[PDB]
Amino acid sequence: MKILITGGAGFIGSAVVRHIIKNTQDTVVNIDKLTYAGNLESLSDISESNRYNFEHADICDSAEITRIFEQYQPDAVMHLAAESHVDRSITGPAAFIETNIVGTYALLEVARKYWSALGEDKKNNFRFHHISTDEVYGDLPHPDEVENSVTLPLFTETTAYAPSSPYSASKASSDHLVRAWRRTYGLPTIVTNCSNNYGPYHFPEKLIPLVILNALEGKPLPIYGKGDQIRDWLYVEDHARALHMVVTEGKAGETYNIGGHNEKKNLDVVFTICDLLDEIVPKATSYREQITYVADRPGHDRRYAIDAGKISRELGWKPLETFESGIRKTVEWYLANTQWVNNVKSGAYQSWIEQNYEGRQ
Amino acid sequence: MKILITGGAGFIGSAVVRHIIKNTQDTVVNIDKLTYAGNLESLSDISESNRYNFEHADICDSAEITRIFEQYQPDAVMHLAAESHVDRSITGPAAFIETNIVGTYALLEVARKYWSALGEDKKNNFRFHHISTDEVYGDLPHPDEVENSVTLPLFTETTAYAPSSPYSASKASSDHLVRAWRRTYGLPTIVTNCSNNYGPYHFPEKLIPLVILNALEGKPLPIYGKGDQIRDWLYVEDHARALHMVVTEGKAGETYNIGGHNEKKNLDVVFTICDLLDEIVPKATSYREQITYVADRPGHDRRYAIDAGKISRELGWKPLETFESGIRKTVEWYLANTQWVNNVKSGAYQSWIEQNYEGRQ
Ligand SMILES: NC(=O)c1ccc[n+]([C@@H]2O[C@H](COP(=O)([O-])OP(=O)(O)OC[C@H]3O[C@@H](n4cnc5c(N)ncnc54)[C@H](O)[C@@H]3O)[C@@H](O)[C@H]2O)c1
Ligand SMILES: NC(=O)c1ccc[n+]([C@@H]2O[C@H](COP(=O)([O-])OP(=O)(O)OC[C@H]3O[C@@H](n4cnc5c(N)ncnc54)[C@H](O)[C@@H]3O)[C@@H](O)[C@H]2O)c1
Numbered sequence A, B: 001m002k003i004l005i006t007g008g009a010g011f012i013g014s015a016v017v018r019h020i021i022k023n024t025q026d027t028v029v030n031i032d033k034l035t036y037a038g039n040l041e042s043l044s045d046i047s048e049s050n051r052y053n054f055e056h057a058d059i060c061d062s063a064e065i066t067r068i069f070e071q072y073q074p075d076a077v078m079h080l081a082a083e084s085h086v087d088r089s090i091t092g093p094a095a096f097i098e099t100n101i102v103g104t105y106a107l108l109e110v111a112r113k114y115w116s117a118l119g120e121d122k123k124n125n126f127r128f129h130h131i132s133t134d135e136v137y138g139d140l141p142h143p144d145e146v147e148n149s150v151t152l153p154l155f156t157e158t159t160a161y162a163p164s165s166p167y168s169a170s171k172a173s174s175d176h177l178v179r180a181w182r183r184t185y186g187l188p189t190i191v192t193n194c195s196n197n198y199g200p201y202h203f204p205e206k207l208i209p210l211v212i213l214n215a216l217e218g219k220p221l222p223i224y225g226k227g228d229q230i231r232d233w234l235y236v237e238d239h240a241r242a243l244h245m246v247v248t249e250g251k252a253g254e255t256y257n258i259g260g261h262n263e264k265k266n267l268d269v270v271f272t273i274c275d276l277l278d279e280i281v282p283k284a285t286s287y288r289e290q291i292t293y294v295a296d297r298p299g300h301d302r303r304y305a306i307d308a309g310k311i312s313r314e315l316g317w318k319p320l321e322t323f324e325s326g327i328r329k330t331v332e333w334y335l336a337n338t339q340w341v342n343n344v345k346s347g348a349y350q351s352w353i354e355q356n357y358e359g360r361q
């Protein structure tokens, strides 16, 4: 099967591309604009494959995207291209509205026209897989807000949308467009909403990779508020396996939440990374001494937790890593890939760090 | 109070403006792009008031909208500007993405910057009222799908978003942006979602005005599918009263569904109109003879029904008209306002009619 993937040069996208080329017989055409988050180095291990092709393009460029669809004749689409950082969306929402909402709209129109003109066979089997986030569901009650006996709620596929940030509002909106295109035009769409991802090739602006790199560089490890906020951590390679399973076996019109049921408090994750580094790269003092509390994120969602029961019983997907095994693999990966890390740390990255962290709130 | 209203030259917007000038002590600055749906003739009753000012502008024009906010120094905003026709959104979705989503974003940013620079007093009392639709909730179970005994569900403020069309997806997206701006920046926003409106100054592309006018012009009365689909009808003047009540007494961060609990089947509404015309403007044959069953709307939502319990018990709002009283007033209004009709109908209107109805599906 020929799969057209947008955002394949990103964190999760590159994992999807590497997985497809290494463990399947499908082919891939990767469309990526190469923003600050795009990195062809993350695809170095498969870029030479005859089953892989790269197209440097913007999903908003309708004419070019249209041409690419006609050239490669994809059997399915996996849409991961997006602006993904909540903190960047707070100070610069425009890029999120543009890429996440308008860009998904532009891609949907190209896909709709393409799909509509396909032969009976190919048309019935075509699939448009929209990759999304658990953040569209809003925030969940926190353990410190309920009785120490009551069972905390989880995000299910029927949980009402209630996005808190420009980023999550942008993704929620994109999800709606995908479903409306399905209901109105019949386009065979599938939507997945996954918990936080972590692992190899993660851009150093998200919690885990930022903490790992800052720790090694002797810099502060910024904790928003009290660090008691909760996130559900899924290893990126596990997400990638789930995504290929969904695009291949998922049912059109369905939604599948993806997660490994691994709720963790931010501070706990940071301590875990620090202890791992104290063990692997010991120095005079503990990396813990770099933990630093800083002003909280405006509108911060205090708890995300995904119920992946549906995808488990319907597709049989199960994560292979545990947070313990995954976080160690992640720390080990960054220590073994200083080449990749040094390249992704440009003056642009430093400017973002100064913008979001120095003189912070 | 100075109220900045967007889309005040439209159907509901003009009713809001007329209500404010005629029945309150508040002032108004109307911003409208004057698309096919914006007609200054709908505001003839109050265009000369010293308490009314009109600004011909596009909400997407940030520079101009900013200048307007600074000049008039509004105490509140009532955002009604939008592309509102589901059928137009099916064949031309771009305008909906642009105006409903990106336009709302653009307006939210101008309002945020304005609100943030306000003095303590004016800043605490400021309100950004987003006018929306019940269509964001998706479709509801239809009477012919459930036991003739079970109680049919209604749309409540906690009903999950599930937009079916490009139009409703566009509005659902705008709603999310408004709530996200509140959660992230603190902007004091309010969102209302109302059922279908009908009454004076309704553009002739929606069911009721189209049927009334086509009947009087000896043209077909186009029924999508079997006409067994259900809509909840609220007289436009009742909506206007509710809206001013909300912007004035509504609580920041709250959502209020608006409706009069008047579920009706499309075919029944058409028969009611035909009976009224057979009575008021009798001819050789019944107007019913012009009814024609045409291809159904793609993705057609079969039933909308709003539960207005919350706004009723919290703000004390109640509709003054019944569907019986309102529909008769509507028919009488069109019979007496041929001048307005002829001024709003144009060459573009006939192009839309041919596009959507002739050789239809
Ligand atoms: N990172 C997470 O924990 C997480 C969790 C749930 C869902 N998601 C979703 O998964 C997808 C991928 O996330 P990610 O973390 O890998 O993002 P990322 O920031 O690592 O990468 C984004 C990628 O998209 C590309 N891109 C951006 N705008 C583009 C445009 N206009 N045209 C083409 N390419 C464009 C970038 O160049 C980059 O390669 C997104 O849709 C995101 O919302 C991410
Ligand atoms: N008509 C209904 O039954 C109904 C029901 C529920 C909610 N709503 C909502 O109520 C609001 C008004 O609905 P309506 O029926 O009166 O619409 P309408 O079609 O009658 O009028 C839309 C108005 O917005 C203006 N407009 C469009 N794009 C603009 C832009 N970019 N900048 C400035 N002005 C622009 C038009 O010129 C026009 O005056 C909308 O937000 C709509 O979604 C309508």
Ligand SMILES: Cc1cn([C@H]2C[C@H](O)[C@@H](COP(=O)(O)OP(=O)(O)O)O2)c(=O)[nH]c1=O
Pocket (backbone or CB within 6 Å): A085, A086, A087, A196, A205, A206, A207, A208, A210, A222, A223, A224, A225, A227, A229, A230, A231, A266, A297, A301
């Ligand atoms: C980037 C960052 C995040 N966080 C917190 C905020 C979130 O609760 C959690 C993960 O943030 P992040 O990686 O930005 O992911 P997301 O916002 O999608 O969940 O870590 C910090 O405490 N400090 C930081 O420097």
Ligand SMILES: Cc1cn([C@H]2C[C@H](O)[C@@H](COP(=O)(O)OP(=O)(O)O)O2)c(=O)[nH]c1=O
Pocket (backbone or CB within 6 Å): B085, B086, B087, B196, B205, B206, B207, B208, B210, B222, B223, B224, B227, B229, B230, B231, B266, B297, B301
């Ligand atoms: C415009 C139109 C609508 N309808 C139906 C579709 C809807 O069920 C109902 C009202 O349609 P419409 O006025 O377009 O409003 P909305 O889509 O917001 O509810 O009337 C017809 O049967 N024929 C027509 O020509």
